[PDB]
Design a protein around this motif. Structure first.
Motif, PDB file in Angstrom:
ATOM      1  N   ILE A 178      -7.635  -1.327   6.546  1.00 58.40           N
ATOM      2  CA  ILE A 178      -8.131  -2.473   5.690  1.00 58.40           C
ATOM      3  C   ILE A 178      -7.954  -3.891   6.497  1.00 58.40           C
ATOM      4  O   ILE A 178      -8.543  -4.885   5.975  1.00 58.40           O
ATOM      5  CB  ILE A 178      -7.177  -2.320   4.507  1.00 58.40           C
ATOM      6  N   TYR A 179      -6.877  -3.997   7.387  1.00 56.63           N
ATOM      7  CA  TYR A 179      -6.695  -5.047   7.802  1.00 56.63           C
ATOM      8  C   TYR A 179      -7.198  -5.249   9.459  1.00 56.63           C
ATOM      9  O   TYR A 179      -7.194  -6.461   9.730  1.00 56.63           O
ATOM     10  CB  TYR A 179      -5.032  -5.480   7.814  1.00 56.63           C
TER      11      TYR A 179
ATOM     12  N   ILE B 178      -8.574  -4.717  -2.223  1.00 53.77           N
ATOM     13  CA  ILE B 178      -9.073  -5.027  -0.697  1.00 53.77           C
ATOM     14  C   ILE B 178      -9.997  -6.389  -0.892  1.00 53.77           C
ATOM     15  O   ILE B 178      -9.711  -7.288  -0.191  1.00 53.77           O
ATOM     16  CB  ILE B 178      -9.950  -3.806  -0.303  1.00 53.77           C
ATOM     17  N   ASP B 179     -10.636  -6.505  -2.320  1.00 55.47           N
ATOM     18  CA  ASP B 179     -11.591  -7.563  -2.350  1.00 55.47           C
ATOM     19  C   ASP B 179     -10.711  -8.952  -2.560  1.00 55.47           C
ATOM     20  O   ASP B 179     -10.852 -10.003  -1.939  1.00 55.47           O
ATOM     21  CB  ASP B 179     -12.274  -7.389  -3.596  1.00 55.47           C
TER      22      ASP B 179
ATOM     23  N   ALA C 132     -16.098  -3.215   0.725  1.00 58.43           N
ATOM     24  CA  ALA C 132     -14.869  -2.702   0.363  1.00 58.43           C
ATOM     25  C   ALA C 132     -15.019  -1.361  -0.595  1.00 58.43           C
ATOM     26  O   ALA C 132     -13.983  -0.699  -0.438  1.00 58.43           O
ATOM     27  CB  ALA C 132     -14.381  -3.791  -0.592  1.00 58.43           C
TER      28      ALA C 132
ATOM     29  N   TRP D  74      -4.531   3.724   6.049  1.00 54.33           N
ATOM     30  CA  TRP D  74      -4.881   2.526   5.320  1.00 54.33           C
ATOM     31  C   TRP D  74      -4.668   1.034   5.787  1.00 54.33           C
ATOM     32  O   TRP D  74      -5.681   0.282   5.508  1.00 54.33           O
ATOM     33  CB  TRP D  74      -4.140   2.583   3.797  1.00 54.33           C
TER      34      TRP D  74
ATOM     35  N   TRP E 151       0.892  -1.207  -0.057  1.00 53.17           N
ATOM     36  CA  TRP E 151      -0.007  -0.050   0.034  1.00 53.17           C
ATOM     37  C   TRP E 151       0.756   1.444   0.001  1.00 53.17           C
ATOM     38  O   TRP E 151       0.339   2.183  -0.841  1.00 53.17           O
ATOM     39  CB  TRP E 151      -0.916   0.070   1.235  1.00 53.17           C
TER      40      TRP E 151
ATOM     41  N   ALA F 101      -7.158 -10.031   4.618  1.00 52.80           N
ATOM     42  CA  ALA F 101      -7.925  -8.864   5.251  1.00 52.80           C
ATOM     43  C   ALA F 101      -9.367  -9.409   5.559  1.00 52.80           C
ATOM     44  O   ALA F 101      -9.906 -10.336   4.937  1.00 52.80           O
ATOM     45  CB  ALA F 101      -8.191  -7.778   4.156  1.00 52.80           C
TER      46      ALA F 101
ATOM     47  N   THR G  69      -8.688   0.265  -5.866  1.00 51.95           N
ATOM     48  CA  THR G  69      -8.495  -0.055  -4.497  1.00 51.95           C
ATOM     49  C   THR G  69      -9.500  -0.951  -3.876  1.00 51.95           C
ATOM     50  O   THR G  69      -9.062  -1.725  -3.030  1.00 51.95           O
ATOM     51  CB  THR G  69      -8.135   1.180  -3.534  1.00 51.95           C
TER      52      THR G  69
ATOM     53  N   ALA H 245     -12.931   2.082   0.321  1.00 54.74           N
ATOM     54  CA  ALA H 245     -12.019   2.494  -0.723  1.00 54.74           C
ATOM     55  C   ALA H 245     -12.421   4.177  -0.943  1.00 54.74           C
ATOM     56  O   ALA H 245     -11.563   4.866  -1.104  1.00 54.74           O
ATOM     57  CB  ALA H 245     -12.068   1.772  -2.116  1.00 54.74           C
TER      58      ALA H 245
ATOM     59  N   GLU I  54      -7.598  -9.139  -1.216  1.00 57.34           N
ATOM     60  CA  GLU I  54      -7.115  -9.396   0.051  1.00 57.34           C
ATOM     61  C   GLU I  54      -7.965 -10.169   0.983  1.00 57.34           C
ATOM     62  O   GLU I  54      -7.301 -10.966   1.675  1.00 57.34           O
ATOM     63  CB  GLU I  54      -6.565  -8.074   0.761  1.00 57.34           C
ATOM     64  N   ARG I  55      -9.263 -10.043   0.657  1.00 58.39           N
ATOM     65  CA  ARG I  55     -10.275 -10.706   1.668  1.00 58.39           C
ATOM     66  C   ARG I  55     -10.426 -12.069   1.183  1.00 58.39           C
ATOM     67  O   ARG I  55     -10.356 -13.025   1.811  1.00 58.39           O
ATOM     68  CB  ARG I  55     -11.529  -9.964   1.496  1.00 58.39           C
TER      69      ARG I  55
END
Ligand SMILES: O=C(Cc1cccs1)N1CCC(c2nc(-c3cccs3)no2)CC1
Ligand SMILES: O=C(Cc1cccs1)N1CCC(c2nc(-c3cccs3)no2)CC1
Lengths: 194, 194
Positions: free
Chosen positions: A190-191, A132-133, A147, A186, A82, A141, A128, A151, A135-136
């Motif tokens: 996000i996490y 994120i999607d 998401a 961020w 990031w 995440a 972004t 974002a 990562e999930r």
């Protein structure tokens, strides 16, 4: 032709460092570009049109850099991922402060500039949200906020925060601290499970 | 006197719902307030001065509500604490959308409006940094970013995000989702170790 157009653009960026667009005349731009006022009008209808073109170039430069970064798998830890992405914007816009500043002000008075900015924000938000999607999907995440909504707020934060910093607004995060500041927000948002 | 001044302010807020300040004349304000144009000038030098006064009232209303909230110990969990605080602004500004919108636009063209906004942002940032500091002192929040820098980015996020939502900008977080969105980002960023 192209060199005359490029000289107009270069002159406009140069003069924008010193004063607002309203304080720059067509005469100023033509003189800097080594052309007459009537030949200026061959390349651009207005000084406003010159600013739009400058902004378009800067926004596309940022967007292309993000794409290049995206095209890498770039083996890294999540915080660094990031950070490198936010850095694309910090460096690109931070290297064109006068255009950034003038471009943002023109949002209020130019539908074309407003639409240009909106278009790229939408693009950057979608990208972004997609990361994120991913990562999930990977289990990296947690599934917290929608998401795309997450974002949106994060990108709007970056817009306001980077640009306040570059302009030295009161209040603003010091330019030398703004990257670490945004990265922290961020990564935690996000996490963070909570 | 006060009633004539209040009628001018009420008329201005009412007309601002429909059109921008530039599309509202002194004649419009005087007529709405049931006064002549020359008597308008007794109470205000310009329609710009009327907007400044409206903004001043709204900003002080938000600030006073935050103070009242602060004066409570208000036995709660940390997420709810921040939620109630952000809500003060969501409700106060969200209840005066036309003034909020016009007020923000006037930042570009009015040094007085710009200074007013800056003053209160500084105040709200200092207060959030003080609460973050207290949380850290209590052992409830980790010592991560400089508190004042963290507060600055979070408050700037709220400014951009709330106001984009109220204006229905593209892009924006839906107004019905913006409170939960901002609360998540505040709580994760303030309490997240990483
Ligand atoms: O800062 C921004 C966009 C901005 C908007 C306004 C000012 S700066 N972004 C948007 C894109 C975002 C992003 N990075 C990535 C990465 C992919 C791979 C490495 S980083 N995906 O989305 C980084 C931060
Ligand atoms: O949303 C904002 C300020 C805004 C700035 C621009 C738009 S909204 N704040 C600032 C103050 C912040 C805060 N709350 C508190 C609380 C104390 C006790 C309960 S909440 N302290 O600081 C809440 C959120």
């Amino acid at each position: 032709g192209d060199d005359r157009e490029l000289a107009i653009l270069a002159t406009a960026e140069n003069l924008l460092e010193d004063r607002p667009l309203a304080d720059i005349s067509v005469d100023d731009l033509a003189k800097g570009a080594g052309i007459s006022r009537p030949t200026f009008y061959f390349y651009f209808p207005s000084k406003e049109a010159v600013l739009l073109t400058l902004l378009d170039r800067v926004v596309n430069q940022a967007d292309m850099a993000l794409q290049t970064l995206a095209e890498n798998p770039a083996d890294t830890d999540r915080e660094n991922m990031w950070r490198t992405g936010i850095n694309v914007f910090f460096e690109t816009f931070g290297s064109h402060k006068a255009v950034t500043r003038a471009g943002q002000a023109a949002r209020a008075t130019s539908v074309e500039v407003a639409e240009l900015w909106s278009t790229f924000m939408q693009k950057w938000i979608a990208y972004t949200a997609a990361v994120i999607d991913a990562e999930r999907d990977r289990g990296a995440a947690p599934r917290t906020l929608p998401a795309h909504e997450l974002a949106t707020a994060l990108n709007l934060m970056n817009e306001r925060t980077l640009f306040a910093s570059f302009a030295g607004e009161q209040p603003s995060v010091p330019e030398a601290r703004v990257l670490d500041t945004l990265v922290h927000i961020w990564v935690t948002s996000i996490y963070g499970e909570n």
